Design a protein around this nucleic acid. Sequence first.
DNA 1: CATCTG
DNA 2: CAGATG
Length: 327
Amino acid sequence: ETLNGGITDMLTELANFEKNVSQAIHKYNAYRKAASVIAKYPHKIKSGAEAKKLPGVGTKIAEKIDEFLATGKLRKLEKIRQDDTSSSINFLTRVSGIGPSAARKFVDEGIKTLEDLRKNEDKLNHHQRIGLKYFGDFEKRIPREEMLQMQDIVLNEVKKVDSEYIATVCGSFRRGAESSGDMDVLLTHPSFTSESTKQPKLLHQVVEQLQKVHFITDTLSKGETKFMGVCQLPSKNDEKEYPHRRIDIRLIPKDQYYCGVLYFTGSDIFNKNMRAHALEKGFTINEYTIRPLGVTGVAGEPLPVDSEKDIFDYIQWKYREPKDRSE
DNA sequence: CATCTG
DNA sequence: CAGATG
Ligand code: NA
Ligand code: NA
């Protein structure tokens, strides 16, 4: 956690690079199990040889550990941190819609900057175009004070369209958090579930109200159960308009809302432990359900949940206010 | 995993 | 349809 910190870090830089610049998924996956294991490792790694003794730890990595332990640096890392090509890829990638793959093509065609991108807006798709237009806004965290106003609007409009909708804002927002990255709304309806053959309108009507009032400003991706967009809190008595924020809305069959809601709410560490305890209690949980665990090895059959309560209950546990879902 | 692009 | 992004 701090005893093999640099090591785990260098490894991470390395891994990243394989994957992002090279197309070295193998190598890339190599650095990661390695950091993973050194990380768990109980002692202060004093040498490569020591490390090598570990699984995931080969001779090449051992080698690197040496030079780094031997000197506060690593040549390779040093070379990579310079390379403009490598830097461009790390950067373009910050644009929403641009992944590594696209980053390479772009660089190869000589686009390595923001300006580059504007010039060539033509070679970018809708998502990437939007992603460029709001580059700044998108990198700005969302203060809870805004979050409360967003949520305020969203719920009031879903309500109008149909009293029967059930919307929930998950995320760190929900675990208390002072600011957040984007807005994630879980949506359900009685008239939609596991069997029920669809209802696309279910999602579309809402998305539509939201734009009616101008809260949603653009669409990144809109399918029949998941929508990726951009919204914006109306600028008041103009002087101060707000940044454009990322928002996502997803329709879930009512029969698996709470597991969804549970799940999306995190934190990751919370889930795990919860998942791990579920297991003890003779259960299983995932993003959509909790199932009784047979002894034959496994076994299923979705237990029925009416709230996040039902879930805890099941595994016979202490109902946790979202806030303490930290770990 | 669900959407989009080409 | 593969393949890419979130
Ligand atoms: Na990106
Ligand atoms: Na292939």
